Design a protein around this ligand. Sequence first.
Ligand code: ADP
Ligand code: MG
Length: 703
Amino acid sequence: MEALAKEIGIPEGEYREIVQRLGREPNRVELLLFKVMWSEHCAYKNSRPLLKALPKEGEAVLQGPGENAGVVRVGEGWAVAFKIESHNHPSAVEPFQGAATGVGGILRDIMSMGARPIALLDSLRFGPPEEARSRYLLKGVVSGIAFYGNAIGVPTVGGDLYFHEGYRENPLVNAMCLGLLREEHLKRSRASLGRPIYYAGAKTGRDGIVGDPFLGKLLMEATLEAIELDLVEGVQDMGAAGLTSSLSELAHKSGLGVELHLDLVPTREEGMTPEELLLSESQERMVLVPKEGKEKALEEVFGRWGLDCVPVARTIPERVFRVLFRGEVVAEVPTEALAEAPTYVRVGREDPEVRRLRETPIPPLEADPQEVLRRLLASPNLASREAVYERYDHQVGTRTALLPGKGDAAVLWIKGTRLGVAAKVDQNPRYSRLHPRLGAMHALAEACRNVSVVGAKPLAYTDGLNLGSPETPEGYHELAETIAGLKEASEALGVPVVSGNVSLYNESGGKRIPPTAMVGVVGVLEVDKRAEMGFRRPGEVLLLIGEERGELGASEVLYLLTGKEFGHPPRLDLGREKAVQEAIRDLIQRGLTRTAHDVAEGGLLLALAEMTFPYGVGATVEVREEGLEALFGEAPSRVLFTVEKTRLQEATLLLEERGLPYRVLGETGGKSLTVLTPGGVLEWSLEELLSAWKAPLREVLDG
Ligand SMILES: Nc1ncnc2c1ncn2[C@@H]1O[C@H](COP(=O)(O)OP(=O)(O)O)[C@@H](O)[C@H]1O
Ligand SMILES: [Mg+2]
């Protein structure tokens, strides 16, 4: 029956392997099950072999890759679950539902760990902001993101937005979620023999073979209460491949099989066929396995939240996924056959054009810095995302609260404790397109730097990989270099992966999106020893860890002045990066500084301007090197911070004992940003910096 086989999308080679795993040919239904379970989305066929390289060990790791999300210990009995997913292709066809659905799904993965969602972060990539479609997609996904999150009660505390040429055809929408729980309640996707499997949530319809957040809230409370009462031994959310992936996965990890009675499955539409029920991806659906003797309890938990919770399947000793419908066995495939699909290895080769661009020498450039800073602040990639986060609410919850003082990483305070959880997601497409490996390294480094900058220690990360097809040598190369990049940054900084995602085939017409590894990092700190980026008072000494000179390759200023992106991305010394991150955390924990900000895209001056916005406090400094490289050039491992006058020596003593280059630029205060250079004084009023920075994205989004 190879006919229908290759007619649905299953490769001859793959089909032949399926007949040898079943010792027979699958019927129509079984064939449809494999088509979906063996697709790259579910099987990760081309990425698994490479992902084995990512370091997983870490002091704070409680749960790494394998479960619906990664979990790390944060102290005083608390733990944090988190993960990042993608909903690219669907957001492309319909931005509103795509984004909202991306949020619903990520939320369920975090809930299944028994962790109550405390925050959402979005990682977005669209084409240039002047193009109609780019504006459309941006309006769509943020509208959709706001809709689900605001309705379910989980705030979107931050994220990463970037506009770029390489995303014109394939936009990216990744959602990261943070959830907290008591370690004692850490649950996974396990089931013991002889247990019934419950189904709760919306009824199964003919969906993706729109999300309801209102029902999501109910679903979330019940699941969380159910686990908080220790009534379950396993919980699984239903997403891609619906019931099929939920149960087979659950069964496979449990070392046994599951018998599904489709007739007991709640239906929303009439005349639904077996495959339709099995492959529906209807939203807000949940699988739960009550512990022995707690079935009733589980039902009551859902009864309390006005939800139905009914038995739909049971575990069996035979490691198989047996599907029953109207009295007949319509499918019975071995669990292993469904969960362990073939993987592929290829030979990557870099796209010669990528090399050509990277090796292009950066030409001598000249421009009026008075205007370059204003032009950079007005760039849609550097301007305020204020109009975006204004769509979201619920910064204050029932256990956690977002600290309103703008820090480089979102900081969620755990009420009743001194604990604070910091989070950030990063990646630079320009660096990544020109040097995927260095781009990936920069992403993890930056994310960790941002958390370190508010005073928290990086505990682990989550990586949402987004690339073109792995078929072509150039594409596989980008995937390979991206993964090698993370490994290298991870090993050097001592920060392990705990979860993640992989989205491939993000390309059309031979045009590949810039390799995109959206790195999410979680860390913890004492809310009382926190730092934010805004200058808070006049008279503080302003210092810089690292050097003033940045590079122009793949930089913002280069793009602004040439309209192009080329050259080598900034070099990254992982040893320096680690030492700087520890230096800044020490500085903050010892109470020497409570205001820090790292120097990233746009260079020293842009970083400087961003610090005057939060409180309207200016700064006066001296930069010893003139030239674009010093004022706007980019370089990692650079951090700005302020100390109280009589504490300068202790801070400088600390940096010196760490062998770290540093400089005392000047002080804070006034209603201007003033910069002395060997060629004179450059000056801007905080007003002009502010208006230039505030307008760009606000009109694009609300105009
Ligand atoms: N790039 C990656 N890095 C680390 N872990 C990953 C990566 N991609 C996938 N994983 C892990 O492999 C598993 C598969 O993800 P997935 O099946 O898509 O979960 P779901 O479908 O419910 O969103 C998860 O445990 C996930 O955390
Ligand atoms: Mg930053």
